[PDB]
Write an enzyme that holds these catalytic residues in place. Sequence first.
Site, PDB file in Angstrom:
ATOM      1  N   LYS A  29       3.376   6.911   5.668  1.00  0.00           N
ATOM      2  CA  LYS A  29       2.184   6.417   4.502  1.00  0.00           C
ATOM      3  C   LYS A  29       2.191   4.709   4.583  1.00  0.00           C
ATOM      4  O   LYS A  29       3.764   4.538   4.239  1.00  0.00           O
ATOM      5  CB  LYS A  29       1.817   6.474   3.052  1.00  0.00           C
ATOM      6  CG  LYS A  29       0.662   5.434   2.217  1.00  0.00           C
ATOM      7  CD  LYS A  29      -0.288   5.523   2.516  1.00  0.00           C
ATOM      8  CE  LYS A  29      -1.280   4.562   2.091  1.00  0.00           C
ATOM      9  NZ  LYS A  29      -1.468   3.124   3.676  1.00  0.00           N
ATOM     10  N   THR A  30       1.882   3.912   5.010  1.00  0.00           N
ATOM     11  CA  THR A  30       2.073   2.515   5.573  1.00  0.00           C
ATOM     12  C   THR A  30       1.972   1.595   4.607  1.00  0.00           C
ATOM     13  O   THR A  30       1.094   1.774   3.500  1.00  0.00           O
ATOM     14  CB  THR A  30       1.253   1.786   7.207  1.00  0.00           C
ATOM     15  OG1 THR A  30       0.356   2.338   7.271  1.00  0.00           O
ATOM     16  CG2 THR A  30       2.199   2.658   8.718  1.00  0.00           C
ATOM     17  N   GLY A  31       2.205   0.023   4.515  1.00  0.00           N
ATOM     18  CA  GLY A  31       2.261  -0.763   3.410  1.00  0.00           C
ATOM     19  C   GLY A  31       1.902  -2.528   4.459  1.00  0.00           C
ATOM     20  O   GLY A  31       2.683  -1.928   6.020  1.00  0.00           O
ATOM     21  N   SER A  91       1.206  -1.141   0.213  1.00  0.00           N
ATOM     22  CA  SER A  91       0.149  -0.437  -0.003  1.00  0.00           C
ATOM     23  C   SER A  91       1.122   1.087   0.036  1.00  0.00           C
ATOM     24  O   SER A  91      -0.025   2.303  -0.210  1.00  0.00           O
ATOM     25  CB  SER A  91      -1.077  -0.063   1.598  1.00  0.00           C
ATOM     26  OG  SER A  91      -2.215  -0.799   1.176  1.00  0.00           O
TER      27      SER A  91
END
Length: 260
Positions: free
Chosen positions: A206-208, A42
């Site tokens: 922004k993580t994933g 993501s």
Amino acid sequence: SVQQQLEALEKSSGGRLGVALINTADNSQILYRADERFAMCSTSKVMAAAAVLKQSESDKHLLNQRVEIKKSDLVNYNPIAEKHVNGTMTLAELGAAALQYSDNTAMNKLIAHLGGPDKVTAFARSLGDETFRLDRTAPTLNTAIPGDPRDTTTPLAMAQTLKNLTLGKALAETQRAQLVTWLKGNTTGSASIRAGLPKSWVVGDKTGSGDYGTTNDIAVIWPENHAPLVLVTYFTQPEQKAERRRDILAAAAKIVTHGF
């Protein structure tokens, strides 16, 4: 040393760690497997959102345009788009959901509007990023299969590009400011990079998270009395159903930011 600390962290973690930190004060860097490819998962949403912002620089109508949210648009995760089934969402609202809540339906609409994953790749290329590549939509772009080149990039490449997008030449002032506002308002990363930094520091990220216990986070950090720092921490494991390790990202962030 920092390098010895990271390798030790990697060794005990049971996976593969990728780190890339850029100190904008003097452009110095701290790299660990920074030239190796990792599945972005993501974190690739930042490139999709930014691609739409670039278009809005030439169309004052774009961001407020509407898209209708059907029940058939809902995929594996869409906490915000669900609240709007049978209604509509502006491109701006989709950008917000995709980044601050990591809404997968929101991401797909953005990809759709741009004309497909290949278009996001072209946008990345126009920014001077010759590494980034988006091949699929959500949620399959998160399979993170070892050695699979699809939907990957390198830590250094993503760090360089995140810097250009939030602090450099990539976007016009208003758009750039919009991207930054979205990143700072992220709600999905308290246990990742943020957890490894002083409580007072301002952070946008922004993580994933995907298969093979893939745990990622890319962020822009604003210390109280120093120039900004751009950090990318990617982590992935050998077995398909390994648990994510957001705590490894926090640990890596603390290791590399020691001294700022």
